[PDB]
Amino acid sequence: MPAEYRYKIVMLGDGAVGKTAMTTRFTQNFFDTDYKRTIGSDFAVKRLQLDDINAHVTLQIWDLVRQGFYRGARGGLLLYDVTRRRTFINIENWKEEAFRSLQKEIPLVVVANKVDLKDSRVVATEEGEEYAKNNSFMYVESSALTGENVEEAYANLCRIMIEESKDISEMTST
Amino acid sequence: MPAEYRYKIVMLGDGAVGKTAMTTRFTQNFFDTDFAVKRLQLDDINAHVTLQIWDLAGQPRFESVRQGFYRGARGGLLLYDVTRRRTFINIENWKEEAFRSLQKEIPLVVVANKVDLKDSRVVATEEGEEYAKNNSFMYVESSALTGENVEEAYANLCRIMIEESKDISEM
Numbered sequence: 067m068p069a070e071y072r073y074k075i076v077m078l079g080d081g082a083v084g085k086t087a088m089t090t091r092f093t094q095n096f097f098d099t100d101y102k103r104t105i106g107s108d109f110a111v112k113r114l115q116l117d118d119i120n121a122h123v124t125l126q127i128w129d130l131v132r133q134g135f136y137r138g139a140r141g142g143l144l145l146y147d148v149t150r151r152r153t154f155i156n157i158e159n160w161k162e163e164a165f166r167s168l169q170k171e172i173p174l175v176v177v178a179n180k181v182d183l184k185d186s187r188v189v190a191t192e193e194g195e196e197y198a199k200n201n202s203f204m205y206v207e208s209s210a211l212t213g214e215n216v217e218e219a220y221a222n223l224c225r226i227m228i229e230e231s232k233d234i235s236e237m238t239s240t
Numbered sequence: 241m242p243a244e245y246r247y248k249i250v251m252l253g254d255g256a257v258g259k260t261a262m263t264t265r266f267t268q269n270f271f272d273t274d275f276a277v278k279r280l281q282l283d284d285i286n287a288h289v290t291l292q293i294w295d296l297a298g299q300p301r302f303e304s305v306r307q308g309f310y311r312g313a314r315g316g317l318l319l320y321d322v323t324r325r326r327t328f329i330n331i332e333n334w335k336e337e338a339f340r341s342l343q344k345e346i347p348l349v350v351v352a353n354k355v356d357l358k359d360s361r362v363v364a365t366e367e368g369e370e371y372a373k374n375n376s377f378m379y380v381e382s383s384a385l386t387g388e389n390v391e392e393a394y395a396n397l398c399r400i401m402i403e404e405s406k407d408i409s410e411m
C-alpha cells in the first residue's frame with residue numbers, strides 16, 4: 067500500500083497571473099478563457115500518486131481574510147505572468163506576506179506562467195531562475211493553456227513537502 | 241549602513257569526498273594532494289559575509305544527535321564524490337544527522353565533487369539534480385582540483401542564508 071500524505075497548499079501571485087487557471091488545469095485537466103470561478107469554494111482537491119516513492123498525496127489547493135487563507139499551509143506555488151513585469155516584481159511581496167502570516171518559511175516553487183505567449187513575453191527565463199536560486203526555490207515554466215509543466219510544478223512541491231514530513235519524523239524520533 | 245552578515249556553515253559528506261580540498265580551494269586559492277574562515281563580498285547586493293567553515297576530522301560514524309558540531313550552523317554544503325556511489329547514497333544520512341542535531345532544517349547546497357574525474361565518474365548529473373530537487377536544494381558540479389564552481393557553491397549558499405535572514409527579520 068502507498069504511504070499517505072495530506073497537505074494544504076496556497077496559490078500566490080498578482081491578479082490575472084493564472085492561479086485559477088493553473089488550479090483548474092491540475093484538478094480538472096482543461097482550460098477555458100470563460101471559466102467562472104465561484105466564491106462558494108475556498109479550495110480545490112487533488113489526489114496524486116507519486117510512483118517514484120509509492121506515495122499518495124491528497125492536496126487542498128487554496129486560491130484567493132489573509133490569516134485564514136495561509137493558516138495551516140505546508141507549501142505553495144508562487145506565480146507570475148511572464149508577459150507582465152510588475153507581476154514578477156511582486157513575487158517577493160507575496161513570499162514575504164506568506165512567511166509573515168505563518169511566522170515560518172514554507173517551501174515555494176516559483177512558477178513563470180503563460181509561457182505559451184511567446185511573442186509578448188517580457189520576463190526572461192534567466193531572471194526567474196536567478197530569483198528562485200537566491201531563495202533555494204525550484205523554478206518551473208508553465209502554461210495552464212497548453213498544460214506544459216503544470217502537473218510537474220505541483221508534483222515537485224509535493225515531493226518537497228513529503229521530504230520535509232520525513233525530516234520532521236526523524237527530528238521527533240531522536 | 242552597509243549590510244554585514246556572519247554565518248557558521250558545515251561541510252558534510254563521507255570521508256575523502258573533498259571537504260577539506262574544497263575549503264582550501266575556496267579560502268586559500270590552491271589545491272595540493274598532500275573551523276576555517278572566509279571573508280567574501282556579494283557585489284550584486286553589496287553584502288559582506290564572514291563565514292566560519294566547520295568540518296569533521298577523520299571519518300566519524302553517523303550519530304542520532306552529534307554534540308557541538310552543528311550548533312549555531314545556518315547552512316551547509318552536502319558533498320559527495322561522483323566516482324564513489326556509496327558517498328552519494330550517504331548524503332541523505334548526513335542531511336538527517338544535521339537536521340536531527342539542530343531540530344530544524346537549514347539550507348544545504350548539494351555538491352557533486354571531483355567532476356574532473358570524467359572516466360571514473362559513476363553518479364550521473366541527473367541523479368544529483370533529482371536528489372537536490374526533491375529537497376528544494378540547489379545543485380552544483382564542482383572540482384576542488386580545477387576550482388570549477390567552488391566559489392559559486394559557497395556564494396549561492398551565502399545568498400540563500402542572507403535571504404533567510406531577511407525572511408526572519410520580516411517575520
Ligand SMILES: Nc1nc2c(ncn2[C@@H]2O[C@H](COP(=O)(O)OP(=O)(O)O)[C@@H](O)[C@H]2O)c(=O)[nH]1
Nearest residue numbers: 081082083084085086087099179180209210211
Ligand atoms: N495564454 C494563456 N492564458 C492564460 C494562462 N493562464 C491563465 N490565462 C488567462 O489569463 C487570465 C487570468 O487567469 P486567472 O486564472 O483568472 O488568473 P488569477 O487571477 O491569477 O486566478 C484569464 O483570461 C486566463 O484564461 C496561460 O498559461 N496561458
Ligand SMILES: Nc1nc2c(ncn2[C@@H]2O[C@H](COP(=O)(O)OP(=O)(O)O)[C@@H](O)[C@H]2O)c(=O)[nH]1
Nearest residue numbers: 255256257258259260261273353354383384385
Ligand atoms: N581529482 C580530484 N581529487 C580531489 C578533489 N577534491 C579532493 N580530491 C582528493 O580526494 C582526496 C580526499 O580529499 P579531502 O579533502 O581529504 O576529503 P575529505 O576527507 O572529505 O576532507 C584527496 O586526495 C584530495 O586531493 C577533486 O575535485 N578532484
Ligand SMILES: [Mg+2]
Nearest residue numbers: 085086103130
Ligand atoms: Mg483567480
Ligand SMILES: [Mg+2]
Nearest residue numbers: 259260296298
Ligand atoms: Mg578532511
